[PDB]
Design a protein around this ligand. Structure first.
Ligand SMILES: [Ca+2]
Ligand SMILES: [Ca+2]
Ligand SMILES: [Ca+2]
Lengths: 86, 87
């Protein structure tokens, strides 16, 4: 898994992580936002679908009992996401 | 500041921020770890002084009422730091 667990249980996840692997890790079945459109295969792809083409650091949403927050951009790349299961 | 504040009051700060600007921004009078020695000029350099040449995501330390946690590396570069003030 292209992700590392923090002291509070949350994960710093690279945006290049595939959704198949993301769902396998967290034991999910549900497609992430935008995945049904057929164009999206990575966590960063979902971030841009949900938050727009150039999101900002701290931009955040909830999905299926998880929160996702942009914690690092590299120019237009959504490079690192903070993921947290409630 | 090349830094943005999160909802809980912590800050996401680029490793490239100069220590001058960091201290100006947080109005700090004390030099950060390793700064006094004169070899350190950026927040990333403090991370490396404190944590070693290749720290890992989540490596953390505390100093003078702040915590600093590595939240992104880009290969060998400390690219983003979570900075938080503690009561
Ligand atoms: Ca960056
Ligand atoms: Ca980065
Ligand atoms: Ca990175």
């Amino acid at each position: 898994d292209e992700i590392v667990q923090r002291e509070d249980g949350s994960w710093l996840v690279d945006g290049m992580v595939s959704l198949d692997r993301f769902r396998e890790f967290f034991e999910l079945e549900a497609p992430l936002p935008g995945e049904a459109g057929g164009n999206i295969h990575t966590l960063a792809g979902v971030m841009l679908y949900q938050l727009g083409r150039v999101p900002s650091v701290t931009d955040r949403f909830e999905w299926n009992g998880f929160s996702f927050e942009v914690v690092d951009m590299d120019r237009t790349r959504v490079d690192k996401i903070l993921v947290q299961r409630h």
